[PDB]
């Protein structure tokens, strides 16, 4: 800059920056579950 216009640049300093890595959880099946039938119920009502 001084080579061109005798004026020098203001100094810029970027300090140390902390960057966060959010936690991640991966689930792999350790077994299967088949729900056992216990009861099935259906109710229909018409009210007039």
């Amino acid at each position: 800059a001084n080579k061109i216009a005798d004026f020098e640049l203001p100094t810029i300093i970027v300090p140390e920056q902390t960057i966060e890595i959010p936690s991640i959880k991966f689930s792999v099946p350790a077994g299967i579950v088949i729900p056992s039938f216990q009861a099935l119920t259906a109710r229909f009502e018409v009210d007039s």
């Binding site: 970027v14 920056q17 960057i19 350790a30 077994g31 299967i32 579950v33 088949i34 729900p35 056992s36 039938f37 216990q38 009861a39 099935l40 119920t41 259906a42 109710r43 229909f44 009502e45 018409v46 009210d47 007039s48």
Partner: protein
């Protein structure tokens, strides 16, 4: 929907001032609506008419039900799953710790089990960083 039970419930409520409709007579029968039906409440005069419909679907399930679970043996530093013990290949393989070139990452030592399945509960990652002349140098702390 959950592990224990499933609920599907829908209800429809309608309200309408259909009083005038109820105020009708039948010349073919020569009878009134309320009279012919023989109903007065909401029919003789005609009232604010409601229609109510309910549908309830409910099913019961066991959260544990009929479950097939892999056999797992858990230790402080490892898990052991006794899979098929085939003798065709080498029983074990030991992996020494390795220093990755140009960085400080230390690969933790591990023992690989073929007859069983051996997992190590926690794996340790050594810290490492980039070496640059005044550039932003990322320094990585250890993570387990």
């Amino acid at each position: 929907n959950d592990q224990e039970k499933a609920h599907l419930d829908i209800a429809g409520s309608l309200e309408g001032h259909l009083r005038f409709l109820k105020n009708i007579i039948l010349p073919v029968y020569d009878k009134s609506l309320w009279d012919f039906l023989k109903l007065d409440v909401t029919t003789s005069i005609g009232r604010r008419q409601h229609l109510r419909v309910s549908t309830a679907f409910v099913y019961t399930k066991n959260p544990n039900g009929y479950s097939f679970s892999i056999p797992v043996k858990v230790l402080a530093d490892k898990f052991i799953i006794p899979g098929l013990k085939l003798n065709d290949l080498n029983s074990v393989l030991v992996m020494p710790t390795f220093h990755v070139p140009f960085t400080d990452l230390q690969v933790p030592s591990c023992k690989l089990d073929f007859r069983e399945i051996q997992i190590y509960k926690k794996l340790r990652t050594s810290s490492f960083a980039l070496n640059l002349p005044t550039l932003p140098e990322v320094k990585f702390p250890e993570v387990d």
